[PDB]
Write a protein that binds this ligand. Structure first.
Ligand SMILES: [Mg+2]
Ligand SMILES: [Mg+2]
Ligand SMILES: [Mg+2]
Ligand SMILES: [Mg+2]
Ligand SMILES: [Mg+2]
Ligand SMILES: [Mg+2]
Ligand SMILES: [Mg+2]
Ligand SMILES: [Mg+2]
Ligand SMILES: [Mg+2]
Ligand SMILES: [Mg+2]
Ligand SMILES: [Mg+2]
Ligand SMILES: [Mg+2]
Ligand SMILES: [Mg+2]
Ligand SMILES: [Mg+2]
Ligand SMILES: [Mg+2]
Ligand SMILES: [Mg+2]
Ligand SMILES: [Mg+2]
Ligand SMILES: [Mg+2]
Ligand SMILES: [Mg+2]
Ligand SMILES: [Mg+2]
Ligand SMILES: [Mg+2]
Ligand SMILES: [Mg+2]
Ligand SMILES: [Mg+2]
Ligand SMILES: [Mg+2]
Ligand SMILES: [Mg+2]
Ligand SMILES: [Mg+2]
Ligand SMILES: [Mg+2]
Ligand SMILES: [Mg+2]
Ligand SMILES: [Mg+2]
Ligand SMILES: [Mg+2]
Ligand SMILES: [Mg+2]
Ligand SMILES: [Mg+2]
Ligand SMILES: [Mg+2]
Ligand SMILES: [Mg+2]
Ligand SMILES: [Mg+2]
Ligand SMILES: [Mg+2]
Ligand SMILES: [Mg+2]
Ligand SMILES: [Mg+2]
Ligand SMILES: [Mg+2]
Ligand SMILES: [Mg+2]
Ligand SMILES: [Mg+2]
Ligand SMILES: [Mg+2]
Ligand SMILES: [Mg+2]
Ligand SMILES: [Mg+2]
Ligand SMILES: [Mg+2]
Ligand SMILES: [Mg+2]
Ligand SMILES: [Mg+2]
Ligand SMILES: [Mg+2]
Ligand SMILES: [Mg+2]
Ligand SMILES: [Mg+2]
Ligand SMILES: [Mg+2]
Ligand SMILES: [Mg+2]
Ligand SMILES: [Mg+2]
Ligand SMILES: [Mg+2]
Ligand SMILES: [Mg+2]
Ligand SMILES: [Mg+2]
Ligand SMILES: [Mg+2]
Ligand SMILES: [Mg+2]
Ligand SMILES: [Mg+2]
Ligand SMILES: [Mg+2]
Ligand SMILES: [Mg+2]
Ligand SMILES: [Mg+2]
Ligand SMILES: [Mg+2]
Ligand SMILES: [Mg+2]
Ligand SMILES: [Mg+2]
Ligand SMILES: [Mg+2]
Ligand SMILES: [Mg+2]
Ligand SMILES: [Mg+2]
Ligand SMILES: [Mg+2]
Ligand SMILES: [Mg+2]
Ligand SMILES: [Mg+2]
Ligand SMILES: [Mg+2]
Ligand SMILES: [Mg+2]
Ligand SMILES: [Mg+2]
Ligand SMILES: [Mg+2]
Ligand SMILES: [Mg+2]
Ligand SMILES: [Mg+2]
Ligand SMILES: [Mg+2]
Ligand SMILES: [Mg+2]
Ligand SMILES: [Mg+2]
Ligand SMILES: [Mg+2]
Ligand SMILES: [Mg+2]
Ligand SMILES: [Mg+2]
Ligand SMILES: [Mg+2]
Ligand SMILES: [Mg+2]
Ligand SMILES: [Mg+2]
Ligand SMILES: [Mg+2]
Ligand SMILES: [Mg+2]
Ligand SMILES: [Mg+2]
Ligand SMILES: [Mg+2]
Ligand SMILES: [Mg+2]
Ligand SMILES: [Mg+2]
Ligand SMILES: [Mg+2]
Ligand SMILES: [Mg+2]
Ligand SMILES: [Mg+2]
Ligand SMILES: [Mg+2]
Ligand SMILES: [Mg+2]
Ligand SMILES: [Mg+2]
Ligand SMILES: [Mg+2]
Ligand SMILES: [Mg+2]
Ligand SMILES: [Mg+2]
Ligand SMILES: [Mg+2]
Ligand SMILES: [Mg+2]
Ligand SMILES: [Mg+2]
Ligand SMILES: [Mg+2]
Ligand SMILES: [Mg+2]
Ligand SMILES: [Mg+2]
Ligand SMILES: [Mg+2]
Ligand SMILES: [Mg+2]
Ligand SMILES: [Mg+2]
Ligand SMILES: [Mg+2]
Ligand SMILES: [Mg+2]
Ligand SMILES: [Mg+2]
Ligand SMILES: [Mg+2]
Ligand SMILES: [Mg+2]
Ligand SMILES: [Mg+2]
Ligand SMILES: [Mg+2]
Ligand SMILES: [Mg+2]
Ligand SMILES: [Mg+2]
Ligand SMILES: [Mg+2]
Ligand SMILES: [Mg+2]
Ligand SMILES: [Mg+2]
Ligand SMILES: [Mg+2]
Ligand SMILES: [Mg+2]
Ligand SMILES: [Mg+2]
Ligand SMILES: [Mg+2]
Ligand SMILES: [Mg+2]
Ligand SMILES: [Mg+2]
Ligand SMILES: [Mg+2]
Ligand SMILES: [Mg+2]
Ligand SMILES: [Mg+2]
Ligand SMILES: [Mg+2]
Ligand SMILES: [Mg+2]
Ligand SMILES: [Mg+2]
Ligand SMILES: [Mg+2]
Ligand SMILES: [Mg+2]
Ligand SMILES: [Mg+2]
Ligand SMILES: [Mg+2]
Ligand SMILES: [Mg+2]
Ligand SMILES: [Mg+2]
Ligand SMILES: [Zn+2]
Lengths: 174, 16, 37, 204, 140
RNA sequence: CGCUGAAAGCAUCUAAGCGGGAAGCCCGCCCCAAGAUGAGGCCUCCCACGGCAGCCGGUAAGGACCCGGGAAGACCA
RNA sequence: CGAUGUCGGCUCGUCGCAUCCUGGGGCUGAAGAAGGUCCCAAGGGUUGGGCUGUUCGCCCAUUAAAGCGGCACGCGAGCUG
RNA sequence: AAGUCUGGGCUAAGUGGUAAAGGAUGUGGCGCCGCGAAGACAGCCAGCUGGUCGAGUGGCGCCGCGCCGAAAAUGAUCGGGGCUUAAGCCCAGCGCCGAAGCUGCGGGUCUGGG
């Protein structure tokens, strides 16, 4: 029944410097800063980071959980890193890499070229699976979402750009 | 829409 | 989306959420999606 | 951005790929830069261009001074082109090649006191069926007690023409540098012998 | 005995750092200084208040959601000529006008109030061109 | 419509934060515009006049009057 | 009531939005196309005719569409009658 | 013109500064049961019981203040500016300002008593 006061395991060897309103998390895969409410106090313990809240009113409880998870994701970010996988279902539909860039061939009159932003890597194993990877979790999920929006799953046919592990709910056709 | 007619059709006078 | 002055839960899987000053009802079933207005 | 001053000389059509094409001929060159406007000095970027030679008998001392500081013969017309800085000290028609598109500004022909029909294409009145001395009249100019007034900008009779007009995106059909001549496709504001400005178009 | 009425005095110039201050609560004081009601010899029918120089007026602060909700309004006299500009945009485009509008509305209407408004010198950024007058730093 | 995400171990477009998104809104195009009395700016020209922030007078740079006109125009401009 | 000229047309518009079209959406008993229904949106647009004094309405031929209202049932020191 | 007055509290809508049935995990405050260290609620591994987690958790009622419901015609606005531990709202105070009311000073006239 709580998230903020659950302690954050910090792997070896990633560091956590603490500033007012932000924390920096460096590690084997890069560094990224986490902006944090000045009302919250993060704490640097042995091999572990904790977050404490100044009271038990509403805004403070809400900020608590958020802050803890925010930093936990940063920690896992620079160590394990983040990824999301995309399934490309549909006959003519395929993907390939062109340099760092991703080329979606998905039923339009043209192919669509997605450029990886800073801190983001594209991978194409099969021509029907795409891997979005980077140390920033919200950035990975965003880009993944971006890629999917190019051709969202059809409502009547198993066709388009799918999340790995997203179910294929369909409606009957005529 | 046709309703009443609250004034007669007018005509100009002659001061002097 | 249905836009009504009375937004209610339609099925046990409906969910009354509130974002941006407005009362929504979102759900697994797209037909049950409501916004108060 | 690039531009030149010129005079409107007249209209013709020429033949180009078995097609007749209406042109307006413009004498544009040659225009000496006589002052440059700079961000440190004036706050913006432009080039003051002179045009047409003037009898120094008619050019007063304050004007003489301006010319002299530029080392330029007395000219009849000074006019600027914003965001234009030619590497040269003289601007000619050669800045425009055929196929380029241009914006031409001139001073439209003046109709003086124009009726509401010529000016604003009002329908005027009927010419029979009882119409009473209102054949070229504008009709109502308002409402009643509310708002009990006439809007600003009400189209009404008044002066018309002899005002700055710009027609945009005209094809450069030819340029004849040895006669300082520019051929532009279509119609250009103003009368023959009228001062005009030719600028590189702003359309794409 | 009749009430003292002052002869013309050398007006005082004044400097205010607007940074971080609340728009209306600052304006209130700027007006008072303008009317010169801080002066014990106040006279209502002459300009005898201070000259007020304000800096960092782009860094004025405001409460609630007024950045997105406060609307400044302008009618041009033409049909449909009511233009609407939010605080956020006014700060982005003409930040000094924010503090200028607030103060102006808290000055008397009429010939004198207009004069008192002209004795108000507002600037975005920390610098002002009136060191020549050597304005006295005010804490408000 | 989303990303990330607590309160509320799940979930949540939101309470921290970040995206996408209209012929519409702000710029951008065209025209007016410093009486914008908040009367802006640059280039150039004249200049240190005689009399007892004022006055009378003669000039400088320049302006007007008058005339020949004008795809400018009711007069005026 | 020591006068606030009254329908309709014409001329000229201007505003509202409960939107007729065009733009953006959600749900669909949405396969596609084409519809339904609700949400956002007032920038622009919204035809020519037959009948009747008509407003309205019906009809013809089209249209992206042929929107509904306010302005003294907008407008007779503007016209018609 | 006179308090950016003092002390407790609520509101986050510019509510205050135009409205109803009704709808809502808005926020604060009370109340009542249900369920749980014999291990509940949530999630991860089974079939309403089982296993590791180690606390609280789920429904009901009243109260304060807010949210939606909320479309109309020239240009907007709480009178304006502007106001968010207030310059809003509830409770309790101290002080001030404020009329041709009342007081002080002078005068007029009538009436009544000297
Ligand atoms: Mg194809
Ligand atoms: Mg769809
Ligand atoms: Mg079927
Ligand atoms: Mg009647
Ligand atoms: Mg609906
Ligand atoms: Mg219902
Ligand atoms: Mg139910
Ligand atoms: Mg939003
Ligand atoms: Mg759901
Ligand atoms: Mg430039
Ligand atoms: Mg010109
Ligand atoms: Mg005419
Ligand atoms: Mg005419
Ligand atoms: Mg004529
Ligand atoms: Mg004509
Ligand atoms: Mg015309
Ligand atoms: Mg015509
Ligand atoms: Mg006509
Ligand atoms: Mg006609
Ligand atoms: Mg005609
Ligand atoms: Mg007649
Ligand atoms: Mg006639
Ligand atoms: Mg009108
Ligand atoms: Mg009026
Ligand atoms: Mg006008
Ligand atoms: Mg003219
Ligand atoms: Mg073309
Ligand atoms: Mg404050
Ligand atoms: Mg202050
Ligand atoms: Mg003070
Ligand atoms: Mg503040
Ligand atoms: Mg704000
Ligand atoms: Mg108007
Ligand atoms: Mg307009
Ligand atoms: Mg409009
Ligand atoms: Mg409007
Ligand atoms: Mg306007
Ligand atoms: Mg406009
Ligand atoms: Mg007053
Ligand atoms: Mg989702
Ligand atoms: Mg998520
Ligand atoms: Mg989560
Ligand atoms: Mg979680
Ligand atoms: Mg937010
Ligand atoms: Mg909030
Ligand atoms: Mg956004
Ligand atoms: Mg997206
Ligand atoms: Mg268009
Ligand atoms: Mg000008
Ligand atoms: Mg101009
Ligand atoms: Mg000027
Ligand atoms: Mg000018
Ligand atoms: Mg002037
Ligand atoms: Mg002004
Ligand atoms: Mg300037
Ligand atoms: Mg000037
Ligand atoms: Mg300048
Ligand atoms: Mg110059
Ligand atoms: Mg001398
Ligand atoms: Mg001299
Ligand atoms: Mg002397
Ligand atoms: Mg003199
Ligand atoms: Mg002379
Ligand atoms: Mg002449
Ligand atoms: Mg003449
Ligand atoms: Mg003419
Ligand atoms: Mg003359
Ligand atoms: Mg009467
Ligand atoms: Mg009379
Ligand atoms: Mg009378
Ligand atoms: Mg009468
Ligand atoms: Mg009358
Ligand atoms: Mg007709
Ligand atoms: Mg007519
Ligand atoms: Mg007609
Ligand atoms: Mg109107
Ligand atoms: Mg209308
Ligand atoms: Mg309006
Ligand atoms: Mg409706
Ligand atoms: Mg219809
Ligand atoms: Mg559409
Ligand atoms: Mg539409
Ligand atoms: Mg649609
Ligand atoms: Mg169907
Ligand atoms: Mg079908
Ligand atoms: Mg379709
Ligand atoms: Mg639809
Ligand atoms: Mg309908
Ligand atoms: Mg609407
Ligand atoms: Mg519209
Ligand atoms: Mg309209
Ligand atoms: Mg017709
Ligand atoms: Mg007919
Ligand atoms: Mg009819
Ligand atoms: Mg009518
Ligand atoms: Mg009808
Ligand atoms: Mg009928
Ligand atoms: Mg019938
Ligand atoms: Mg059609
Ligand atoms: Mg259609
Ligand atoms: Mg029709
Ligand atoms: Mg209809
Ligand atoms: Mg209509
Ligand atoms: Mg009406
Ligand atoms: Mg009437
Ligand atoms: Mg009526
Ligand atoms: Mg009428
Ligand atoms: Mg009525
Ligand atoms: Mg009508
Ligand atoms: Mg009408
Ligand atoms: Mg009338
Ligand atoms: Mg009338
Ligand atoms: Mg008449
Ligand atoms: Mg009539
Ligand atoms: Mg009248
Ligand atoms: Mg206080
Ligand atoms: Mg206080
Ligand atoms: Mg207090
Ligand atoms: Mg609200
Ligand atoms: Mg309010
Ligand atoms: Mg309100
Ligand atoms: Mg209410
Ligand atoms: Mg109610
Ligand atoms: Mg209720
Ligand atoms: Mg409660
Ligand atoms: Mg127990
Ligand atoms: Mg369990
Ligand atoms: Mg509201
Ligand atoms: Mg409305
Ligand atoms: Mg509306
Ligand atoms: Mg209204
Ligand atoms: Mg209204
Ligand atoms: Mg309205
Ligand atoms: Mg309105
Ligand atoms: Mg208090
Ligand atoms: Mg008395
Ligand atoms: Mg007495
Ligand atoms: Mg007495
Ligand atoms: Mg008596
Ligand atoms: Mg006696
Ligand atoms: Zn449901």
């Amino acid at each position: 029944s709580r998230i903020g006061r659950l302690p954050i395991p910090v792997p070896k060897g990633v560091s956590v410097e603490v500033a007012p309103g932000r924390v920096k998390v460096k590690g084997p895969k890069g560094e990224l800063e986490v902006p944090v409410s000045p009302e919250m106090r993060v704490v640097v313990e042995e091999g572990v980071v904790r977050v404490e809240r100044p009271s038990d009113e509403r805004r403070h409880k809400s900020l608590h959980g958020l802050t803890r998870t925010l930093i936990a994701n940063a920690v896992k970010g620079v160590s394990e890193g983040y990824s999301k996988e995309l399934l490309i279902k549909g006959i003519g539909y395929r993907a390939r890499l062109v340099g760092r860039a991703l080329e979606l061939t998905v039923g339009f009159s043209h192919p669509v070229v997605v450029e990886p932003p800073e801190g983001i890597t594209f991978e194409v194993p099969e021509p029907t699976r795409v891997r979005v990877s980077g140390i920033d979790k919200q950035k990975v999920g965003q880009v993944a979402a971006n890629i999917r929006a190019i051709r969202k799953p059809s409502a009547y046919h198993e066709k388009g750009i799918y999340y790995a592990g997203e179910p294929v709910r369909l409606k009957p056709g005529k | 829409v046709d309703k009443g007619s609250y004034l007669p059709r007018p005509t100009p006078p002659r001061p002097i | 989306m249905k836009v009504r002055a009375s937004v209610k839960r339609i099925c046990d899987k409906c969910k009354v959420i509130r974002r941006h000053g407005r009362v929504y009802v979102i759900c697994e079933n797209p037909k049950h999606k409501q916004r108060q207005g | 951005m690039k531009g030149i001053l010129g005079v409107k000389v007249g209209m013709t059509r020429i033949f180009r790929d078995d097609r007749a094409v209406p042109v307006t001929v413009i004498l544009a060159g040659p225009c000496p830069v006589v002052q440059r406007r700079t961000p440190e000095k004036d706050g913006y970027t432009a080039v003051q261009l002179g045009f047409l030679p003037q009898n120094p008998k008619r050019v007063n001392r304050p004007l003489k001074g301006h010319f002299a500081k530029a080392g330029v013969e007395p000219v009849r017309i000074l006019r600027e082109i914003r965001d234009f800085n030619p590497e040269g000290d003289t601007v000619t028609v050669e800045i425009f090649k055929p196929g380029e598109r241009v914006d031409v500004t001139g001073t439209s022909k003046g109709r003086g006191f124009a009726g509401v029909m010529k000016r604003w294409n009002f329908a005027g009145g009927p010419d029979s069926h009882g119409a009473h001395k209102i054949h070229r009249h504008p009709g109502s100019i308002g409402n009643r007690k509310t708002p009990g007034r006439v809007y600003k900008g009400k189209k009404m009779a008044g002066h018309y023409g002899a005002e700055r007009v710009t027609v945009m995106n005209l094809e450069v059909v030819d340029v004849i540098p040895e006669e300082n001549l520019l051929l532009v496709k279509g119609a250009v504001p103003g009368p023959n012998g009228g001062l005009v400005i030719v600028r590189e178009t702003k359309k794409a | 005995m009749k009430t003292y009425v002052p002869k013309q005095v050398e007006p005082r110039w004044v400097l205010i750092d607007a940074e971080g201050k609340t728009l209306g609560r600052l304006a209130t004081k700027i007006a008072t200084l303008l009317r010169g009601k801080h002066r014990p010899d106040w006279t209502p029918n002459v300009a005898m208040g201070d000259f007020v120089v304000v800096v960092n007026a782009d860094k004025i602060r405001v409460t609630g959601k007024k950045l997105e909700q406060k609307i400044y309004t302008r009618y041009s006299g033409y049909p449909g000529g009511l233009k609407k500009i939010p605080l956020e945009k006014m700060l982005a485009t003409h930040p000094e006008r924010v503090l200028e509008h607030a103060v102006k509305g808290m000055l008397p209407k009429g010939p004198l109030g207009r004069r008192l408004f002209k004795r108000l010198k507002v600037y975005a950024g920390p610098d002002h061109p009136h060191q020549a007058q050597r304005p006295e730093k005010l804490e408000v």
